Design a protein around this ligand. Structure first.
Ligand SMILES: C[C@H](CS)C(=O)N1CCC[C@H]1C(=O)O
Ligand SMILES: [Mg+2]
Ligand SMILES: [Zn+2]
Ligand SMILES: [Zn+2]
Length: 234
């Protein structure tokens, strides 16, 4: 029942209720002739909403805000970007123009600036060291260490046992490495194990792209990352 990439035209966004007060948002983009889905999160924060990640681009993110207003009807007051790539910060300006306070760690903000990407306004302190966690309203933000990117955060919703792994966690259907241009392959397995150790009670695990699963997505990602690490150049 989870929206798949073939059921969402580029430019459109779907919302999927994972648990009470927790949705994922699903959008798509074309890259090199293939179409990819991308997930973020929406978490109820009292009578407001906390958004995790843009919908991968300005047009998708405007659609995301319109869909949230249509389907949930609560204001998005804050957004957190979980790393510096365009599926996480692309659309920050749209959020900012709609009165959303945008947040990212200093490490994400510096990497976004280096890349020429959009830069969230606010800085999330207390996340610079692997294993650091901070509360952000109804979620905990956790920096597991470098993995898919040096700045990647994961987001845990304690009330719902939902772990948003972002692009550090692969869906099961991905059996070869995705974008690793900014990754720390050497540290990625260790960072995943930090997630396991910190959230062993997680019941829903949402990857940055593709179908949700459980904590099995973690060891699956480790297996894929190690296979890529050991690729043989002949
Ligand atoms: C824009 C995103 C950031 S994680 C990306 O690089 N993706 C999306 C999944 C694969 C890979 C790609 O370049 O296609
Ligand atoms: Mg696997
Ligand atoms: Zn990424
Ligand atoms: Zn991604």
């Amino acid at each position: 029942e989870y929206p798949t990439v073939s059921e969402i035209p580029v430019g459109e966004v779907r919302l999927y209720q994972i648990a009470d007060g927790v949705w994922s948002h699903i959008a798509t983009q074309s890259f090199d002739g293939a179409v990819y889905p991308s997930n973020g999160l929406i978490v109820r924060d009292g009578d407001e909403l906390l958004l995790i990640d843009t919908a991968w681009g300005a047009k998708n993110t405007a659609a995301l805000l319109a869909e949230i207003e249509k389907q949930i009807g609560l204001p998005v007051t804050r957004a957190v970007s979980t790393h510096f790539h365009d599926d996480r910060v692309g659309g920050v300006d749209v959020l900012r123009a709609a009165g959303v306070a945008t947040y990212a760690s200093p490490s994400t903000r510096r990497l976004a600036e280096v890349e020429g990407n959009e830069i969230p306004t606010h800085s999330l302190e207390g996340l610079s060291s692997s294993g650091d966690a901070v509360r952000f309203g109804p979620v905990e933000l956790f920096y597991p260490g470098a993995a898919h990117s040096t700045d990647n955060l994961v987001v845990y919703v304690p009330s719902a046992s939902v772990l948003f792994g972002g692009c550090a966690i692969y869906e099961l259907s991905r059996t070869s490495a995705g974008n690793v241009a900014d990754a720390d392959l050497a540290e990625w397995p260790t960072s995943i194990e930090r997630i396991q150790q910190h959230y062993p009670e997680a019941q829903f695990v949402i990857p940055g792209h593709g179908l949700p699963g459980g904590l099995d997505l973690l060891k699956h990602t480790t297996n894929v990352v190690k296979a890529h690490t050991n690729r043989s150049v002949v």
